[PDB]
Amino acid sequence: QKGPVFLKEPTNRIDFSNSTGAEIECKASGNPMPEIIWIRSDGTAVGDVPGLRQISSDGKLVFPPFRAEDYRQEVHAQVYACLARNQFGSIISRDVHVRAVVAQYYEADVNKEHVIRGNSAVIKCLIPSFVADFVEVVSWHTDEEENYFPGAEYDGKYLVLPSGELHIREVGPEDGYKSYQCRTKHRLTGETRLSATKGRLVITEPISSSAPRTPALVQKPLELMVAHTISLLCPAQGFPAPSFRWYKFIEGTTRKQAVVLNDRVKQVSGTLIIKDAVVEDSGKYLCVVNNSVGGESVETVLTVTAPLSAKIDPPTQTVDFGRPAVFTCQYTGNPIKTVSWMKDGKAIGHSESVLRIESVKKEDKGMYQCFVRNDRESAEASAELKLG
Amino acid sequence: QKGPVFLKEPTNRIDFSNSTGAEIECKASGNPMPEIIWIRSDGTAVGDVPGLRQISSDGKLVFPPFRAEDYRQEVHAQVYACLARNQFGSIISRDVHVRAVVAQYYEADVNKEHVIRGNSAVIKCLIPSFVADFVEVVSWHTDEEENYFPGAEYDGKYLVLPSGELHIREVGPEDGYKSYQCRTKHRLTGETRLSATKGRLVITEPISSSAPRTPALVQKPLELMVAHTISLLCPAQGFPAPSFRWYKFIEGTTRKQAVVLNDRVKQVSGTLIIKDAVVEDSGKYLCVVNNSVGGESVETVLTVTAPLSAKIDPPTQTVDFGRPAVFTCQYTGNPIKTVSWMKDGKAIGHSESVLRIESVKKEDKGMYQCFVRNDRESAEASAELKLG
Numbered sequence: 001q002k003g004p005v006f007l008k009e010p011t012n013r014i015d016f017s018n019s020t021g022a023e024i025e026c027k028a029s030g031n032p033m034p035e036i037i038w039i040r041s042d043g044t045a046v047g048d049v050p051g052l053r054q055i056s057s058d059g060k061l062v063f064p065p066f067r068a069e070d071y072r073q074e075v076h077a078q079v080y081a082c083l084a085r086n087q088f089g090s091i092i093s094r095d096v097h098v099r100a101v102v103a104q105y106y107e108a109d110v111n112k113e114h115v116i117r118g119n120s121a122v123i124k125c126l127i128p129s130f131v132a133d134f135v136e137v138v139s140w141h142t143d144e145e146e147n148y149f150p151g152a153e154y155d156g157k158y159l160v161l162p163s164g165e166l167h168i169r170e171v172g173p174e175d176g177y178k179s180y181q182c183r184t185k186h187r188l189t190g191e192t193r194l195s196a197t198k199g200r201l202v203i204t205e206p207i208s209s210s211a212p213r214t215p216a217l218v219q220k221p222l223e224l225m226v227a228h229t230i231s232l233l234c235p236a237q238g239f240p241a242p243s244f245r246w247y248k249f250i251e252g253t254t255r256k257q258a259v260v261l262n263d264r265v266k267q268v269s270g271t272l273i274i275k276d277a278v279v280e281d282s283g284k285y286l287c288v289v290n291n292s293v294g295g296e297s298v299e300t301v302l303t304v305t306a307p308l309s310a311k312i313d314p315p316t317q318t319v320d321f322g323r324p325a326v327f328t329c330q331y332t333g334n335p336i337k338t339v340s341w342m343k344d345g346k347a348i349g350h351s352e353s354v355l356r357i358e359s360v361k362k363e364d365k366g367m368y369q370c371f372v373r374n375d376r377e378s379a380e381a382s383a384e385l386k387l388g
Numbered sequence: 389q390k391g392p393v394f395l396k397e398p399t400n401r402i403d404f405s406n407s408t409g410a411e412i413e414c415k416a417s418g419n420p421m422p423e424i425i426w427i428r429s430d431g432t433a434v435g436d437v438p439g440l441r442q443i444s445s446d447g448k449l450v451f452p453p454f455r456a457e458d459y460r461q462e463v464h465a466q467v468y469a470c471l472a473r474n475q476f477g478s479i480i481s482r483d484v485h486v487r488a489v490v491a492q493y494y495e496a497d498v499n500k501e502h503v504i505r506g507n508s509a510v511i512k513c514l515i516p517s518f519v520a521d522f523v524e525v526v527s528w529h530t531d532e533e534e535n536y537f538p539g540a541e542y543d544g545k546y547l548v549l550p551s552g553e554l555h556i557r558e559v560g561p562e563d564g565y566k567s568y569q570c571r572t573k574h575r576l577t578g579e580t581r582l583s584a585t586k587g588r589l590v591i592t593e594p595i596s597s598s599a600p601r602t603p604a605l606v607q608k609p610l611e612l613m614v615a616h617t618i619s620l621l622c623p624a625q626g627f628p629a630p631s632f633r634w635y636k637f638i639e640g641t642t643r644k645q646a647v648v649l650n651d652r653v654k655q656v657s658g659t660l661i662i663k664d665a666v667v668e669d670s671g672k673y674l675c676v677v678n679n680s681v682g683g684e685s686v687e688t689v690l691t692v693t694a695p696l697s698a699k700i701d702p703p704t705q706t707v708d709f710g711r712p713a714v715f716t717c718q719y720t721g722n723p724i725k726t727v728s729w730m731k732d733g734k735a736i737g738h739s740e741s742v743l744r745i746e747s748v749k750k751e752d753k754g755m756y757q758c759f760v761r762n763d764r765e766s767a768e769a770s771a772e773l774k775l776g
């Protein structure tokens with residue numbers, strides 16, 4: 001009576017500590033009831049590995065909590081999928097990226113920041129790149145017992161930015177007798193800790209003028225989710241302390257327009273803050289920094305991401321032999337890198353949103369799917385062809 | 389009998405400490421002998437400022453050595469030019485960027501480097517951005533008394549890169565009991581010093597696998613001079629320790645080709661080293677980093693610069709009223725941002741290498757120049773038009 005359709009798929013990312021374990025669920029309908037098979041996204045079937053990966057009834061793949069000694073990459077750092085299948089054909093779920101992380105000591109550091117008196121400073125909490133997916137800055141603390149949290153600026157001077165740095169306006173000689181530590185939190189173990197080192201501003205008295213200089217290492221392209229606040233920094237030091245202006249390129253041109261500052265889009269010194277991000281905020285930004293000696297600029301690319309979703313019209317159709325069958329994949333989200341089609345679990349080499357079979361024949365019957373992907377997510381829709 | 393031509397112009401950059409002072413020289417020929425006037429590149433005449441800027445005979449602008457208290461931006465952080473002029477017309481020199489820097493304490497730092505055991509490490513000497521134009525890494529030293537200099541790899545393990553970092557292969561638990569300091573040199577004062585802090589590798593035992601991760605801050609576009617060795621880094625950490633491959637984009641496409649490693653172009657772990665750089669090495673490079681869990685990539689832009697030079701054909705010509713006069717500017721160097729023309733010291737709004745006057749008339753007689761610029765340098769050529 002019907003081919004398979006998914007009712008529940010697991011999300012794209014399943015991250016968890018060895019102590020927590022995980023379970024992922026897949027449910028499909030169909031008649032006859034489809035069998036559910038777990039596969040690695042490349043298509044090989046996966047089995048039971050004692051104490052590590054267990055197929056449950058209902059429809060669940062279980063990763064029990066496990067001791068560090070028992071970590072296995074092929075189980076615990078793997079991209080899975082669910083295959084649902086009956087006599088009418090097969091469909092595969094979106095990719096399920098499993099990342100079991102053994103609970104392990106890390107430290108964050110705060111180093112010295114060399115600044116010219118009168119410039120803004122940005123104090124950073126350095127989190128090792130290999131743990132940074134799981135660790136976020138909660139708050140900043142000084143030796144004089146001042147505590148700074150994300151939200152609003154303190155004393156017209158200190159602001160914990162959305163990206164985690166502590167921004168300090170108009171640094172003075174005085175500010176070099178303070179030391180700064182960050183509190184971080186690990187989302188898989190839930191633990192919080194203070195930074196292993198404390199940083200201080202080291203203030204240079206301006207005795208010579210200099211044109212603004214920006215660091216050698218700059219923010220690589222950013223991907224941030226819709227509806228969250230974003231901060232784009234522009235670190236620069238010079239004397240006279242410089243002024244900062246932000247521009248956004250017109251897509252596919254070398255032309256730019258001044259960013260328009262309002263209730264939603266604000267600038268704090270050289271920092272651009274955009275609340276309530278929307279996909280149209282994506283693009284290429286330029287910060288231009290000037291003083292009476294000279295100027296400099298740096299580009300930052302921003303993509304504002306939105307969850308991927310897909311749906312095929314029509315979800316089922318019957319077409320008489322020799323006649324055309326059209327399936328249209330309707331999708332949402334940002335960015336969309338690719339669209340691609342499968343039939344009964346096998347890529348069919350069509351990468352456009354509308355799939356046309358010009359003249360239907362027996363072996364065209366079965367289940368079709370459209371997958372929409374980008375670098376971080378995937379979404380699928382399915383559809384059945386019945387012969388008339 | 390003749391309009392002015394420059395015999396000697398000052399170079400584009402004159403950098404010097406307050407203790408050293410500076411003198412810059414401009415000589416031109418012509419008949420009558422041209423007068424030499426020093427100007428700020430925007431065109432205003434400059435005068436004597438007691439003890440700071442003095443016009444010498446011969447043809448020299450002198451910046452005497454001066455005490456810190458006596459620094460003056462309008463004298464000491466300024467773009468000058470020489471104007472040479474007689475009854476036939478005027479020519480202006482290339483820009484002369486003067487940067488007098490008061491001798492002042494700085495420190496470099498070496499911070500902790502968190503690495504996964506078995507990966508490569510790069511230990512960096514952090515030089516504040518506002519002094520980095522004048523400070524270069526000489527050498528690296530450990531507490532165990534090992535001294536590393538630029539040139540060849542030590543013990544198949546340690547290499548001081550052309551860009552100054554200390555590269556360490558295949559880090560082991562053992563390597564965390566060593567501490568590293570850099571020796572730097574300031575080119576204006578000649579002094580050398582060791583870093584104010586020492587860094588250590590902090591080694592994480594790999595207990596979970598992870599895909600390669602690269603830092604948030606990456607090398608911004610590089611400009612390096614012909615005939616020097618360049619190193620492009622690709623910092624990445626993961627487990628299994630990753631492999632690295634470099635590609636270079638085909639200009640104006642999204643297509644890329646594998647970099648070809650040979651006698652001149654080498655790879656040390658993930659570091660690409662190109663000796664004897666040529667202008668054709670310019671472009672956009674991609675480093676791709678892989679292990680059995682996943683992959684990542686980062687782009688770095690390189691421009692290999694070559695000194696700018698310009699010459700006009702013909703250097704003088706006479707043309708009868710109503711007939712055409714053509715001047716062709718021939719130039720060399722890299723990059724060329726602009727070409728632009730002047731007549732008797734005034735921009736004339738032509739930005740192509742060949743200048744045509746379609747039908748010559750009286751007030752067309754005089755001196756013409758072509759200037760070729762990029763962001764760091766300028767070069768000029770001049771030519772006279774005589775009426776026939």
Ligand SMILES: *[C@@H]1O[C@H](CO)[C@@H](O[C@@H]2O[C@H](CO)[C@@H](O)[C@H](O)[C@H]2NC(C)=O)[C@H](O)[C@H]1NC(C)=O
Pocket residue numbers: 018019065066067068102103104105
């Ligand atoms: C998950 O892995 C870690 C081993 O890192 C386990 O946590 C350790 O447990 C031992 C003994 O109970 C403690 O003494 C260590 O202090 C722990 N280290 C850390 C970093 O927390 C944990 O028991 C494991 N989970 C299991 C096996 O269910």
Ligand SMILES: *[C@@H]1O[C@H](CO)[C@@H](O[C@@H]2O[C@H](CO)[C@@H](O)[C@H](O)[C@H]2NC(C)=O)[C@H](O)[C@H]1NC(C)=O
Pocket residue numbers: 288289290294295296297
């Ligand atoms: C502020 O600084 C920026 C320098 O980065 C200056 O903009 C440049 O201006 C020059 C001269 O007009 C142009 O050729 C460059 O293309 C500009 N760069 C950019 C990124 O726009 C700008 O002129 C400065 N403002 C003042 C008043 O000096």
Ligand SMILES: *[C@@H]1O[C@H](CO)[C@@H](O[C@@H]2O[C@H](CO)[C@@H](O)[C@H](O)[C@H]2NC(C)=O)[C@H](O)[C@H]1NC(C)=O
Pocket residue numbers: 406407453454455456490491492493
């Ligand atoms: C250039 O400027 C610096 C002031 O920074 C002068 O150097 C100082 O000179 C005094 C006394 O001779 C020393 O005690 C300080 O130790 C010096 N400081 C530094 C950083 O070197 C120098 O004399 C000046 N040059 C002149 C006036 O010709």
Ligand SMILES: *[C@@H]1O[C@H](CO)[C@@H](O[C@@H]2O[C@H](CO)[C@@H](O)[C@H](O)[C@H]2NC(C)=O)[C@H](O)[C@H]1NC(C)=O
Pocket residue numbers: 676677678682683684685
């Ligand atoms: C090594 O890692 C890079 C990942 O950055 C992989 O290249 C990507 O491959 C995917 C799948 O083919 C492409 O869609 C991306 O466009 C690729 N990115 C780049 C920058 O080339 C590559 O596949 C990896 N190699 C292996 C064997 O897994």
